[PDB]
Amino acid sequence: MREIVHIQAGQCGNQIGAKFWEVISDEHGIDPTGSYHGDSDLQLERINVYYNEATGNKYVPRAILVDLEPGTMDSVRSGPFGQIFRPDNFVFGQSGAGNNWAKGHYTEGAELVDSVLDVVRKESESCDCLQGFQLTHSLGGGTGSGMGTLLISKIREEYPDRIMNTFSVVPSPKVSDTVVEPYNATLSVHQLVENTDETYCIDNEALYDICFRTLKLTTPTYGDLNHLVSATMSGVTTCLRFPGQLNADLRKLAVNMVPFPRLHFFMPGFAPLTSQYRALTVPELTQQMFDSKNMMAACDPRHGRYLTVAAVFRGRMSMKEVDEQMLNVQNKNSSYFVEWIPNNVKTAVCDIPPRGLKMSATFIGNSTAIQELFKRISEQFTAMFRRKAFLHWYTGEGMDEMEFTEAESNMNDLVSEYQQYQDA
Amino acid sequence: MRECISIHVGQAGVQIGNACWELYCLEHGIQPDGQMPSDKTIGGGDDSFNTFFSETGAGKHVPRAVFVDLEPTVIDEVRTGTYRQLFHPEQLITGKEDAANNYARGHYTIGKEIIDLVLDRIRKLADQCTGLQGFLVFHSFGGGTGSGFTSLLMERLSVDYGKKSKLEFSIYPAPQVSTAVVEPYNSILTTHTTLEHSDCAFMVDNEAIYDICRRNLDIERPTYTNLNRLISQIVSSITASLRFDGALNVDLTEFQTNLVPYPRIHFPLATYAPVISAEKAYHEQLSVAEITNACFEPANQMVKCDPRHGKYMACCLLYRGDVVPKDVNAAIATIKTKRSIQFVDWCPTGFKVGINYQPPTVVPGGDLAKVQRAVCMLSNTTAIAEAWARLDHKFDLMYAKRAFVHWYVGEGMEEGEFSEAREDMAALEKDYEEVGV
Amino acid sequence: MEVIELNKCTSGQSFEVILKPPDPSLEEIQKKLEAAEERRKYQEAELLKHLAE
Amino acid sequence: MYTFVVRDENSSVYAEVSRLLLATGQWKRLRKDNPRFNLMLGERNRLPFGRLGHEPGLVQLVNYYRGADKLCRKASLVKLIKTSPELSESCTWFPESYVIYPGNVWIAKSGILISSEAHVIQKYLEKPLLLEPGHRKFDIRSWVLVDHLYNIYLYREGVLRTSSEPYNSANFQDKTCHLTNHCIQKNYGRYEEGNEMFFEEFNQYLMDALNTTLENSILLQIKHIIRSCLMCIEPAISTKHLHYQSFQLFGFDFMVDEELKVWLIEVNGAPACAQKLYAELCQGIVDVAISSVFPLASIFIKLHHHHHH
């Protein structure tokens, strides 16, 4: 198990997905045209996980870029690292999806999906041992949300034994394109609960607050939020992209993180938060990554309990000190980790730090406090749905009110299920 | 002589085999290409070391070893590494997809598709043997392959070679170094399915070995390299009598007869001394009395537990180096008057001693210091059930909530096999308690 | 303290000292491996039937 | 910020040690099935000693010494004394005792039978020491605390648990005058409150009535019996060089005969303290047994005697 196939869908999907390929291409010594001008052999040892080798020792991202309009994807080709992506993997429609889940899932996107699956199958075939798929998308618009979840469903049909990962950007009124976002998100969460093994919940609420409160950006752009997203994505893929004892794969992650199959919504965290000169001591990384202020999902982990945790330290540091500090927070806050999964915190260290920082920590948590996120979206949803507001946009593409009711019910069930283990 | 086949399954089994076979080669004077200058019968022999090595007409000495991993990366390091020419490609078996820390994936799913390839390569070695005794199996309790694929192999080895002895070398899981949360499920699952098929099993608790490395070798944070090099000295102590001239534990049946009167209770506690740092400038060499006494300290055991609050059914002192009978008896005399060494009413309170004059060999540029004398005590004490109770509690905790169970079921297994396995262990713990009080 | 069965050779010596006296078949196996492939294959059919809906 | 768990709800002593610990700021309590504790305050039956000291990052301490039951069950204490060379069959301070399973007066116990006709049978002390005015029997209770280093700490306040009915040679069935237990009595508190005479008082009585002191006539022999019993089992129970550590509180019960000779009746593995003496004892447990292992931001005598021979 090595090769992953990456798909990015919609405005958000392709914006954050572009930053991901920018960040990791720098980490693996690949340049804006595709050539390797590195220095360490550790950079190329598992370059195969995310890149294909090409004619002339070029490395080509195993990346499929999907949108229902060409706006965002002409920007990706324009932008700093655009010329690296394989041009056949740009698969785009013309009319877009108007922030409408139904258009993504049932009408506009249905027209386009079979072409995306031909590129998926192309990349899937020239793979020694495919472990799975990761998708970047938001849940709030129509393409990345509705079409994205349509893809997932199709990929599962054709490759029912491979892993499915999402980086799924959850919406907030604090960073809001349209009033129908809670609808779109609730329709997609219903899909994600059934058809993914792992989902990283990137809440835009949490990114806005990190940007505002902790980084002193008064007027935060999507660029400022995506700076935080690509550093988190860099962190939660480190163990796949580098060595050397942890034979870490997506299946192993799924097995150890997910005690119950529907409860696979991970809260990510990063330390230190940036946009420095003083490197952080291991105690500080350990305090910071576990801090609510450093979570990429707007949930207080003190309101819930940690089912499982996976922590990843980057830089040159004492592993003695890393165990000591990781054991200190467990022993000093033991009520917040479930007694009925012994040794639920697993920690790893990797010598290569990220660009900029001498040392950093990335956190992956399956906390029951994630319910707060689904409760927040369940509330915004009901505010509108109890008066059937804005529904005509969805019923005009053939959807029924019963489908909204179903979806509202699955999410509220998810919330009940997370609440069940907080009290056990 | 009668030949022995070593089988190494999973990362843990394979890396520990590497460490053992390296050490075996240094001990017998065999070199990385397979040449053994001191051997004069070229192309064959029935010497003690031939139990573990075969010979080619070119003069190469070849392990009676099979390495098996469901994924290639760890066995690739044997293929491309310092002892690459030592092994024959057909001895080294790899898949493409590991068991993902899941007993049931390694046993039922990925197991099924490779069991016939492995048993065929085992038969290729068995058919070079004039009188096979049986098997030494190396594996982890906690890995998906180590647990899951091992237990299917043990089931088949009983069917295909029913008259032969099977010894287990087993790594009991330790949270300090453990890369998975479901090892308690994997360990109880494999222990149940393997119990009737193993004749004698030596548990090694990574916790114990890791603390031995911190405390006695001054290693800040022990790697697998550190743990394994220490484990191979212990393994080597135990298997030396199969590879050298002597009259104790000369075949695999004698391990069972000396160490295992009641056959389900077949988990002997290994204790080992002395472990001394190669970076220690000044070391006062320890005597027979001192190191025989070190064998009744819990801090030197392979599993942490308290033999004082238990009973022995057998003890075996395996000395290496400058030791003579009368020094051992004088040490045994002293120790009996101090310590709590209560035996079971039906067994003779005694010790079977074995001494080999050649002192322990150590890997050059390794962590262990060369010593004038070392000893490995093999005692079947009821105190080792402490290890089962801990592992059983951790299983109870997770299983009450059905946590992670769905991953196993999804590979075809039945929720029933969990409580079935756990009831056998419940019975196992109750057997130890009868004998022990 | 009686020191019985003393055997010596040039590479070592051994003795006892006494302080005080007192399997399923190839059918059954290939069967239940295949019953777990039944249930694996049922589970996957139910998935593909649900996806067909 | 040390952590602990409580698993005996009946311990009056360790209810108070629990309360004293919380009211500090540096000790948090946890739920009984959390593994991540420094201190266990464990259970009387089936304490899982084989799960302690396997939590990386925590030092673990427990308030029982595994194996100490060999001193606290009566049947095994008789067996330990008869069989151990350091307190032989010719042990001058233990009542001649025998074990058979389910001046020649005896007692039987583990419902109690004092007779000559008829578990453990034990010689009955026909001529015990009697307190005047009263003409009445008593037993002494000494509290002893063994820490993690096997220091043996005798607590300076013992207690006489008195009888309050004149003692009778010819009449054995009347239990209020022969059995001096604090329960069996409830003249319950005629001569002293609750049938308890502490040491300052009992010393003065001896001074006045017998022309001696408690130290010389009784306490030297108590200190010798405690030190002899615990040093005997030390190799079998010491937790020096072990992966978890133990302390324990014991209650030794004594009888003084008419010529001032002390006899060991029984050792108790889960004793309760006397009402007055809780605060002073439970504080000293924290000082000596617990805070020695887990330091923060005397009332005992230490029993040690290295005579050279």
Ligand SMILES: Nc1nc2c(ncn2[C@@H]2O[C@H](COP(=O)(O)OP(=O)(O)OP(=O)(O)O)[C@@H](O)[C@H]2O)c(=O)[nH]1
């Ligand atoms: N002593 C020692 N323990 C090891 C080694 N490798 C892994 N372990 C331990 O063994 C357990 C994990 O089992 P592994 O052998 O890695 O798993 P595997 O058999 O390779 O199976 P999968 O990876 O599940 O397919 C944990 O308790 C590890 O700490 C090693 O080289 N030496």
Ligand SMILES: Nc1ncnc2c1ncn2[C@@H]1O[C@H](COP(=O)(O)OP(=O)(O)CP(=O)(O)O)[C@@H](O)[C@H]1O
């Ligand atoms: N051999 C003997 N001679 C004189 N009195 C004796 C005796 N054996 C027991 N007794 C008396 O019987 C009473 C109770 O017996 P014992 O002390 O054995 O049981 P117990 O369980 O009540 C003590 P504890 O519960 O405090 O540990 C004591 O007050 C003691 O004085």
Ligand SMILES: Nc1nc2c(ncn2[C@@H]2O[C@H](COP(=O)(O)OP(=O)(O)O)[C@@H](O)[C@H]2O)c(=O)[nH]1
């Ligand atoms: N963090 C982040 N959120 C985004 C970005 N672009 C859009 N969003 C959010 O995504 C949602 C709208 O989805 P969008 O991707 O534009 O729609 P689609 O193209 O139809 O899939 C809203 O919640 C936006 O706030 C981005 O680059 N970063």
Ligand SMILES: COc1ccc(CNc2c(-c3ccccc3O)nc3ccc(F)cn23)cc1
């Ligand atoms: C109980 O938590 C876990 C146990 C096992 C795994 C599998 N692999 C993995 C990972 C990991 C796996 C896939 C992708 C990204 C990752 O960062 N990160 C760690 C860190 C430590 C460690 F021991 C294993 N890790 C994950 C979580």
Ligand SMILES: [Ca+2]
């Ligand atoms: Ca159209």
Ligand SMILES: [Ca+2]
């Ligand atoms: Ca030869």
Ligand SMILES: [Mg+2]
């Ligand atoms: Mg938009």
Ligand SMILES: [Mg+2]
């Ligand atoms: Mg493996």
